[PDB]
Write a protein that binds this ligand. Structure first.
Ligand SMILES: N[C@@H](CCC(=O)N[C@@H](CS)C(=O)NCC(=O)O)C(=O)O
Ligand SMILES: N[C@@H](CCC(=O)N[C@@H](CS)C(=O)NCC(=O)O)C(=O)O
Lengths: 215, 215
């Protein structure tokens, strides 16, 4: 049967890819609802935030990290949560870092350029820079590393790749990829893992950025 | 011996209380460094962010959630990480929700009123409101609940109480506590748990808020 219901937006959302991916890998079928702010969604997330999740259980969850972790843990033989307590903590670290120091700031960089939140290039430039100095941490970390954590694919690879994909959809052109080769190489690798590619549209990179200022 | 080193600010910092508390409960001694941005701190957190942690191991960690979880997990008999996979996920949820939907917004409410980041009352009012509608989720959730997760104290109680304490230091006067009785009652309860009170200054609540606008 269906293991539960996941409320999200249409397509390949930054905070949802990794959740779909580990569900299909662990053999848990999800019903996907792509219409936010319905009574059943707000029953989980009173604020109407995506992603939100309800088990067939009807066990309720919000926060993308919690949903990803709960799904992943269903498989007591999983390989994706590290070898030992150290590596588990590293996975928590990178998930939390990508969710707060990259996605949040990149969103402040992006929304003004789409019209959503009010616009100001001096403010938009501030966030582009802060976003980039956080990504720089990852660029340098991945020098001579293949995976974020240990020697095989983990939930952090899938979750954080999914997060950063926002950057590859809008800002990260060939030029950017030239200055950020390790992140580019790692991202491109995660996106070609079967577990991840199974639940996403076809991989594709920008030539020119779709965005600079002003709009 | 010392289990490791924790870099933080002086006193009862929103993202550190819970880390000190579970360390002293699990019998792990920490060296506490209260001077940020030293070479050994930036060796962990290149961005100079607090909290950061280095084991005697010299296992390195940043992100308060990851540090709290790593310390807590050292005690394979711990009671603080829930009964089963459902409750573990609930703890992740509340930790992540408090860290992003409350502390982050409350910080945007606070900094302009202290001079740090530029000031604007229309913007400061926006964040006060968003902060409060996230706290409202917790107020309503705690109606007829004692603990955030299950029937006993958990890491989420300690971590999230520690987070929200920022609100009690600056904005949450007797008036506020009247409109938010469940959060007030729960917070006051966590702050009197020995594990938590052991590593904090003496509990104390505001009468009038220390802050409104303008400054
Ligand atoms: N702290 C949440 C953030 C979730 C979030 O903010 N989602 C956005 C979409 S990416 C949303 O649903 N916004 C609707 C709203 O904020 O009202 C998490 O980590 O899961
Ligand atoms: N995502 C981090 C946030 C840590 C953070 O931003 N800490 C603040 C103090 S509360 C800091 O150190 N700021 C210094 C800076 O940003 O340069 C976490 O959850 O641990």
């Amino acid at each position: 049967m269906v293991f539960g219901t996941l409320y999200t937006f249409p397509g390949d959302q930054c905070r949802t890819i990794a959740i779909k991916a580990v569900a299909k890998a662990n053999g848990l079928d999800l019903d996907i609802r792509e219409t936010p702010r319905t009574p059943d969604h707000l029953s989980i997330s009173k604020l109407g935030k995506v992603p939100a999740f309800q088990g067939a259980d009807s066990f309720k969850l919000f926060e993308c990290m919690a949903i990803a972790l709960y799904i992943t843990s269903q498989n007591e033989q999983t390989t994706l949560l590290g070898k030992d307590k150290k590596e588990y903590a590293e996975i928590i670290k990178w998930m939390s870092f990508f969710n707060t120091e990259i996605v949040i700031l990149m969103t402040q960089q992006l929304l003004p350029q789409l019209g959503v939140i009010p616009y100001d290039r001096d403010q938009v430039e501030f966030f582009a820079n802060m976003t980039q100095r956080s990504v720089d941490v990852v660029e340098e970390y991945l020098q001579d590393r293949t995976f974020l954590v240990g020697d095989q694919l983990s939930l952090a690879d899938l979750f954080c790749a999914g997060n950063i994909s926002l950057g590859f959809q809008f800002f990260y052109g060939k030029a950017w990829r030239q200055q950020n080769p390790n992140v580019s190489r790692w991202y491109e690798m995660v996106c070609h893992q079967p577990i991840y590619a199974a639940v996403t549209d076809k991989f594709q990179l920008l030539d020119e950025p779709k965005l600079t200022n002003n709009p």
